[model samples]
Target: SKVTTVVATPGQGPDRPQEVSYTDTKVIGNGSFGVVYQAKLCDSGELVAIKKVLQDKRFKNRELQIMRKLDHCNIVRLRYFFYSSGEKKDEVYLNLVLDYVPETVYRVARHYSRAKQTLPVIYVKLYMYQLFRSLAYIHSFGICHRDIKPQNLLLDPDTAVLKLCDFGSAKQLVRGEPNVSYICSRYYRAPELIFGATDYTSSIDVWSAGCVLAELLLGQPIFPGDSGVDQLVEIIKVLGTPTREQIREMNPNYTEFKFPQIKAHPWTKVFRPRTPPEAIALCSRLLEYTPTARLTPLEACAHSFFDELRDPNVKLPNGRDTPALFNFTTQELSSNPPLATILIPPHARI
Candidate 1:
């Protein structure tokens, strides 16, 4: 099947009047790979975001293909794109038109009112549930969003909805590719990835979902380790070291790495439970050492944590049945581009 092409009009210079067609505006974000700008569709006068690749040759085609194949309410909607061709020295740029969200990334939201916090619980509850709902749909499509952290989640306070963004590292596992191995950002990475295991499944995303949930409850990263080893140490300190036998049970190959001896501490004692027991229970299950035992998105949503705290069936701000909405403001984005740096896993990057 031929992929549908959405092309941008030529010579629609950056400063041109906002045509009924798309027109570029000031850059909101720039990274190692590309730049993103706030734009508008001339016909609708609707605000949109445009992510333009600086060097499209590297992975542009692959990224575009994946985005086109996947369509869901929770995922970033790819409206249209234009690639610069000819005497531009083989240079190409991609324009990704998406719904503009007007709020803060979860990371920024965390630091928003630490000194004199106002609606902490309400903010956490609304965002966490929306995130889970999005993950459920993403997983149902047999794709694993290896990255799940606060920075990647955009919120809209006006509607109290949360949306998942940035799928650059997303992997769509085919039916026969069960043994494929990939890693994502470190803090939210699953224990299976930490143990040097290969052939992982969608459960990797479940671990991240759990991490995000914990962060919302604690108002900070539950295990903010500086390195992979440090992260492992922090996790062990909190959960208690998984015994050699337990490690083997989770994955027999765990013995290959230099397993650190965990000193017992009251780390779990530090966890503050702001929600009901059911929600905490589910969060604990998601953060389990054994990836196989982690709670799935569907299971997590059904757990008492969601049930006791809020109505899981509630619709998001965009009038969408699912709890997915785009609301990340450019001002709220990190000063640095590639936004992935904040969540990059210790092992996944150099």
Candidate 2:
């Protein structure tokens, strides 16, 4: 019997390629799964980023399915994919074909001088708005990105438009499915996830968006911690402990985690904002401890913080003009080492 062959397209995949013809230019980044490479498509002559997934059983089919269904400008675009069919059939390599964006991770962006860097205020306002738009679309489709952080967000070298990437941890949340327990990076994990709550909603994404916003505003991770427990402690320190009323109302079986007592104070009092008043106000809404109380993506996009400052129509600075502002050059970024190379191996790294 002849094996059925699947063609590469927008949504359909599990495609098998006889051989990968593109020349491997360089190594762009690495994750727990595998390394990402910059390569040119032999057939189309298009420059693309190929993510070579490690032979992991847990991620084999799920990553492919999630990438196929996703389509958004603010989110990374999946061009095509090819998986190896070995003699065992079970062990195979997954190659994800994605659009090549010439930009650096936020970690790299920090190396430049403050004047050389576009102010964090502007960066946060712009990227957060884009992130909210993307999350709004994903939630509408009942999908949760699970992992969202500075590393997962890619900036267009020329356009500077933010593109969210890495859907490896994403999952579709059906109405009745058991709540997703293991999700999001430790630092960005929602309060419920930290407290051992099993059931959750799209609000987890909101929590991450808040973390991203804080990173952009403060020029560092707001809750940078070495471990999950440390991360939870940092969160409580900043946001104050979630009350029993807040947790029990959201999840009946929610068991509060052990954390030090936190004094109640407005976040503004702790972290002084260098940005406009509206920007600070909006950041607070996104960082709400109770997921349900957090600002919805749509609501965030419409917040007064964005007033006149937010415009998707704004053109990104040209790569040549703003070389100091970004890390990736037109030549290729694969050779550059991973930024900071955090211990947590989630989809958050760019």
Candidate 3:
């Protein structure tokens, strides 16, 4: 039994640092980057996840800066942040205390797959819609999530609420400034990133989301490539070879590469027979070879695939009502002015 206390600052404001104490801490997750511990706050008895990552004295932390500025319902909330001494001499760790979400989309999907059953279409619509909403919110602020995969999408199985998490690779893309091309996860990496485009836009996140949607519908990764080059080959297998103009759109510097021509696979045959046509249509819009051709996150949210979510009577399989799908803030609506009408139904409007 251990109790820890530290002076921490509130995540969202420039408030005075206060003593925060927590107990019953245990490791929930760990990786090369850092360790995550689940702890209970002594004052509120609320569960929280403390992400402790090594701090470099040389520079400011990008993740902390970004997380502090982000305030969205679909995104994880950073409650507090504090520093702690590491075991090694002069070593310091930045601890981010965040909302503790129990289930991930990866685990939930695997559960259904292990049972030889597909996730219900309704849940797919609900989750993906929320993902697009979150992307829209972040993209409005010119921030690219950089990593959008099943594991990053946290869920509350009971409410079916999805919260996008993990911002270690996330960045604010400034036009003309080069960014690392090798950012996102391989399976969900956009073709532009694979082509070594350093000026890629937030559309990469859209491409990853499209892969997620396809995986949910098909019960497997849509493009499962063993290597970087093989990733393009897998994408070509379905989307066919990118034309010269399309490649130019993705990356202007490298349009001279020669490739064997392949026929475009019909979206209809890509998934199981019963997969919704609207779902396939939405996937096509989000997974374009040309980054600009991909639908904006708000556009994807307005797609017919999520039309069911906007219906007044839609409910989860457990007889519970759907989560807040139309609670769009002014910041989100300002991104696409005209879509505001289409985004909020009369029943959902205040």
Candidate 4:
């Protein structure tokens, strides 16, 4: 490793590309996709995560395109992006320089689980409220975060603020277009995806959100499926067997009517005795077998389970009031507009 510099385009503001430079770059992460480096900017001395991925030179990167279009407090910001030459001739890599958030919901939850304690109920409200807001914002734009798991939810420890990160697997779903269904983390994936449905909707993200919320309350994953078969078996243990119609709604091409018959498990029995009824109720709505049956991101936000987050008096342990969760766009309010009457609290109605 050598210190690297490149002329980069700004994430927002203007199109005036400039000579940006950074140093002290070291590998912090790597996967089948690419490598991520922790680097310090030369100009601002700010920490950034530079995601380096091989570029095809055929089409533009989808993550960069989507990242440029997104602007929200609950989502990580893309400060700048640039290209660099690779070791081999004619090989190029795209570098996405993103704002650095040190912790993730996975690490945070794991800390609690290690201590044999569930994340505080108040913190759960805070995180899930922001998560749904991010989901609603992206879903409004037809973008689906194919991978929605605890690891992708970035955390700012000081402010207790959360931001959704990682757009590598994200795509803007088209009505008639087909997509790979095996796109999400196994434990958090929607059942419809397991059925090999290529035409599924953004509701898959909803199912993943349900899994994250449950993990926060339960101190572990609600459905801990080691393999695809184990995953469905775990789901069946809690949700019981899916009915024939439910299976059809998951994937019309799936015509198998043979599966064990089991009664639906009571939501109350799924969580610890101290868990809130509203929380379990919301989980039930989000983890439905049929894709269309799950609650919309906005609808989930409007659920009573999150009503406490709407209260003006509520504040994080860090002493910040819950972030503005009801800032809805016309397109967002476009769905069930009347629901806002219930979502926006009386004191904040201005």
Candidate 5:
């Protein structure tokens, strides 16, 4: 818990190195990459997460490079990053100092599930809308968050604000550039990814977002498969068989394969009977088989499902005003000028 100081480079704005002080560091989470420590900034008294990962000196780190270029309210802000030496003489570790969000959508959903209750609908709307905004911002810059799952969605439970994190799998996608098809988590993986499509677009993130939306509504993953092939089967069981054209649309190479013709399940029965139709309708658009057919993130944000968030009167279930959902920057609206009219309610306008 001793206060420690280090000269670190800022994540954005300037390249000048500054002395940053922090204390109460402890391991909060870890995986194959490395350990994450939760610490308090000595100056501002703010909590920060330091993600330390072993760096390969041979090349630049994709996560660090992508994080440095990104700046958005719905995305986790990278405060600063520093390099540290490991026990081995040649080993180097990259430490990313990031905003510390105390909860995750995964944990919040599980909490409600464990209590035999559903997450309140308004929270779901608030969280997913922010998620779409994050995706829209990143996708606008051609950065695809290859991994989109509940665990990566950080939440401030009281504010009901969601921030997209874990950009280790994110990349600035280029058209015609082949990417690995074996990316993204299995359950939330898009059908094209399972079909081995390498030249995919940001639409993959849209598909994964749809899966997250459905999971929240159903209280579990919509496609809980045992393996890659079975993942398609789980999807088929509900959405029905992918037609030749649909298969061709997902991946041109798959157009010739014969697949069983199962009738599509009605979206109405896909969730609890009490689930709102607007929410279900939005899910339907996002989970489309043809990647291009899926609603773009900005369009999803403009969907009727999120209209409540635009209303000035809409407040959190606890009676607190909703998070800043209508504060879209000029750059965010630049991609779709027409949508600005519907995205910002009259009451919400300054």
Candidate 6:
């Protein structure tokens, strides 16, 4: 057999590194970051995504460290990780074996866009609500996802489940500590990032989510741009000019940048006719120029836009029951115990 087994560290447990076996491995995805392969575990017969990235060995990988420390239903799981040498001499590679999620929100939304149709409102609610849950869970750990686009959100279409993935850019943001503002994709980048705010918080992810919500409703990017500067212009076109105080809030270090004043675009006209008022209202709250004005992840979870997810009667468009939306683990509930009432309705408690 061409199959090979390697000793690997358990992602969440004691590093008493143990041997793990896999077979039928083949390339499934590739990008600047690395290549991902699909494989089946020999012992558990479970599918996994083996992501291979170059390792310099000068320092530990932050993605691995963060993945090891995280355990949440809405986030992808790193099962096992091991190092291997590449074909060339002294070429080292780090392989992360992660749970295989077959679909992504990006692909799903693209499909709907290509077909000239909107995604089912229930699906939009289901996926976005779970995204908020995942954000809430991660923010509880003081981690900023940095990138929160649809491509990073894994989906199990059959189960109507969503899980946040791709932590390569994730960082635990500390207040007063500087971080690179050149993060997140263009259309999803927070306004503060355009101002080069290095001391931003996890609320950037919230802004990205709001963009995703708008995309779902509009069937295209809300703030498309040719580059970062163009993206800022696109945002300004809709958000109007950022007042001096608003500019100071984004990044105090950024000084005296000027832009022509424009009237704010009405949120109601931002989407096509028949868009839900709750959804529009949610966007109005999220797409603020001020980072702190953005809703906290749990607060977004509690918004009326997501109230459909709390209903016991809600089901997938395919007639299947929705994913476990209210299965809040102790870690999640403890993140905002006060908001648990709204997040998990009285009827949902076990």
Give the alpha-carbon lDDT of every model: 0.62, 0.67, 0.91, 0.87, 0.90, 0.88
RMSD of 4: 1.9
Using TM-score as the measure, the top candidate is 3
Using alpha carbons, what is the TM-score of model 1?
A: 0.75
Residue pairs clashing in model 2 are 27-334, 28-334, 151-350, 159-316
Q: Candidate 1 overall Cα lDDT vs. reference? A: 0.62
User: Per-candidate TM vs. native?
Assistant: 0.75, 0.78, 0.98, 0.94, 0.97, 0.96
Q: Which digits, one per residue and each the tens of the lDDT, describe model 2 over residues 1-350?
A: 12223344444444444444565467997888777888876666678887878566564467777778776777778887766546555687777878887774565457533445434454566667777777877787777888987788887745557778888788888766676665688878777777666668888899898887766666667888788667778877887877778767556684664776687567676555455677667778877766778887766766766644333233334322211212222112222224113211133234
lDDT of 4: 0.87
Please estimate how well model 3 matches the true structure, expressed as its whole-model Cα lDDT.
Answer: 0.91
TM-score of candidate 2 on Cα atoms, chains taken together: 0.78
TM-score of 3: 0.98
Q: In model 3, what lDDT does residue 117 have? A: 86
Winner of 5 and 6 under TM-score? 5
Residue pairs with colliding backbones in model 1 are 19-42, 20-42, 20-43, 101-326, 101-327, 102-327, 185-345, 186-345, 279-305
The window of 10 residues in a row where model 1 has the poorest summed lDDT is 10-19
On a 0 to 100 scale, what is the lDDT of residue 234 in model 1?
Answer: 70
Candidate 3 lDDT over 164-274, as tens digits, reads 999989999999999998878899999998888989999999999999999998888999989877888899999999888888888889833546889999999889998
lDDT of each residue in 215-304, candidate 5, tens digit only? 999889999978877888899989999877888888787623435778999999879999999999999999989999999999999999
Worst 10 residues of 2 by lDDT: 322-331
Q: What is the C-alpha RMSD of each candidate to the true structure, in Å?
A: 11.4, 10.7, 1.2, 1.9, 1.4, 1.4
RMSD to the native, candidate 6?
A: 1.4
- lDDT by residue (15-119, candidate 1, tens digit) is 222223655466776665477777766667677777766554765454555566555555566666566544456676666566666555564555653743433
On the 0 to 100 scale, the lDDT of residue 69 in model 5 is: 89
